[PDB]
Amino acid sequence: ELPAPVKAIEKQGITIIKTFDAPGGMKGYLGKYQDMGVTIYLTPDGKHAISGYMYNEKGENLSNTLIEKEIYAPAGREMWQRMEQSHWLLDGKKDAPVIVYVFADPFCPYCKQFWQQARPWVDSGKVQLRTLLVGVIKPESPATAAAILASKDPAKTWQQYEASGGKLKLNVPANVSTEQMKVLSDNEKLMDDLGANVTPAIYYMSKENTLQQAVGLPDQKTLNIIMGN
Amino acid sequence: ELPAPVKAIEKQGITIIKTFDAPGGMKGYLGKYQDMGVTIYLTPDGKHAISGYMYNEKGENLSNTLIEKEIYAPAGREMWQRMEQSHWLLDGKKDAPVIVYVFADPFCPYCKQFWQQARPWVDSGKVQLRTLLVGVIKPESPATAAAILASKDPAKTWQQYEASGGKLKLNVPANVSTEQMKVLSDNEKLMDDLGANVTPAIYYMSKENTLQQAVGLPDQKTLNIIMGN
């Protein structure tokens, strides 16, 4: 069966995922304790095993890197893809290295405050905000979101809208077009799939491409992390 | 200097105590993170180090054993000795394998309830309670404690006293003898040195002879552990 030392560790509440190659003639075992990832290393003598974190000369926590890359990160990747494939509005340079998605409603105070908080990074060309509009807060939310999508330059209109705190006057069409409705409905479903029904729902990448989330108005630390600072 | 991998771990907030021999050509480092003991193992390749717990074939957490034996346990040993050298009253068989010390005052409800809780273990001959009397709760506490110490068979009188909930009538002398006063004062100082001014203050050994403490009336789990069950 499994080496005795490792079996002893399983009894401490660990469920093994797979084995992997480690340095120094040591064999590695990747597993989980409840929702936490763990790495186990069988010693050369083969009669001992160490549950913990391995660091290299450069000081990198290899265990952490492996755990984030193989356990925490994967599942959310397809979601990041779905957002990229959605009809988002661009705020910032197309080549900005840091990408941040935000599900926003036109009648959402924190959506506007977050928009303002992000200006330094967006204007510097470091961050690009990709907004996925939804109409879920107020009765007029759908029509207003669609009106923005119907404007000559949706991205610019959204920016002006957020900058003005929603005071920007708009040309609201006689009805929501079928395409606009599809966009809103699709975005709302994706947002729902991500687990957060409150706007703004902010998504970004960090920790070995782990899909991260922020809901509501981020505080200073969260803001700096979202911005990739 | 120290191997690079280990130096990286020190930067994570660990202070090294000493090095030690580990299996498989691995070198061990014993240290602390805040008040927590930690063990680090340098890999055979020498370019990696693992911060964690080592288990053997039998399933023993060797790291835990070392940490308890060398870090957590030592400091309190001299205290356990001081209690043994004090004038305690015996409740149970002199050869009972489990020794428990209790600082008690005559006017202490929980002292009496704990005394009752312990009967099964004391009567079975598994546990012996060694009581160090103190007179700190009530004005009459000193005189009453001394009266018990002045009786023909102090240990028996104390047992009867606790069993009767303090209703046992006593012969209270004209004054506290110098020897009795020395005992009470010495016991009070030792109790104070142990960190707990509330009675009952219960002390026992567990986790590689770590001096353990219980204050007040122990709940069912603590009671079973104190009793060595």
From Swiss-Prot, chains A, B:
<feature type="disulfide bond" description="Redox-active">
    <location>
        <begin position="108"/>
        <end position="111"/>
    </location>
</feature>
<keyword id="KW-0143">Chaperone</keyword>
<dbReference type="InterPro" id="IPR009094">
    <property type="entry name" value="DiS-bond_isomerase_DsbC/G_N_sf"/>
</dbReference>
<keyword id="KW-0574">Periplasm</keyword>
<dbReference type="GO" id="GO:0030288">
    <property type="term" value="C:outer membrane-bounded periplasmic space"/>
</dbReference>
<keyword id="KW-0732">Signal</keyword>
<dbReference type="InterPro" id="IPR018950">
    <property type="entry name" value="DiS-bond_isomerase_DsbC/G_N"/>
</dbReference>
<dbReference type="GO" id="GO:0042803">
    <property type="term" value="F:protein homodimerization activity"/>
</dbReference>
<dbReference type="Pfam" id="PF10411">
    <property type="entry name" value="DsbC_N"/>
</dbReference>
<dbReference type="InterPro" id="IPR033954">
    <property type="entry name" value="DiS-bond_Isoase_DsbC/G"/>
</dbReference>
<keyword id="KW-0676">Redox-active center</keyword>
<keyword id="KW-1015">Disulfide bond</keyword>
<comment type="function">
    <text>Involved in disulfide bond formation. DsbG and DsbC are part of a periplasmic reducing system that controls the level of cysteine sulfenylation, and provides reducing equivalents to rescue oxidatively damaged secreted proteins such as ErfK, YbiS and YnhG. Probably also functions as a disulfide isomerase with a narrower substrate specificity than DsbC. DsbG is maintained in a reduced state by DsbD. Displays chaperone activity in both redox states in vitro.</text>
</comment>
<comment type="subunit">
    <text>Homodimer. Interacts with ErfK, YbiS and YnhG.</text>
</comment>
<dbReference type="InterPro" id="IPR036249">
    <property type="entry name" value="Thioredoxin-like_sf"/>
</dbReference>
<dbReference type="Pfam" id="PF13098">
    <property type="entry name" value="Thioredoxin_2"/>
</dbReference>
<dbReference type="InterPro" id="IPR012336">
    <property type="entry name" value="Thioredoxin-like_fold"/>
</dbReference>
<comment type="similarity">
    <text>Belongs to the thioredoxin family. DsbC subfamily.</text>
</comment>
<dbReference type="GO" id="GO:0003756">
    <property type="term" value="F:protein disulfide isomerase activity"/>
</dbReference>
<protein>
    <recommendedName>
        <fullName>Thiol:disulfide interchange protein DsbG</fullName>
    </recommendedName>
</protein>
<dbReference type="GO" id="GO:0061077">
    <property type="term" value="P:chaperone-mediated protein folding"/>
</dbReference>
<dbReference type="InterPro" id="IPR051470">
    <property type="entry name" value="Thiol:disulfide_interchange"/>
</dbReference>
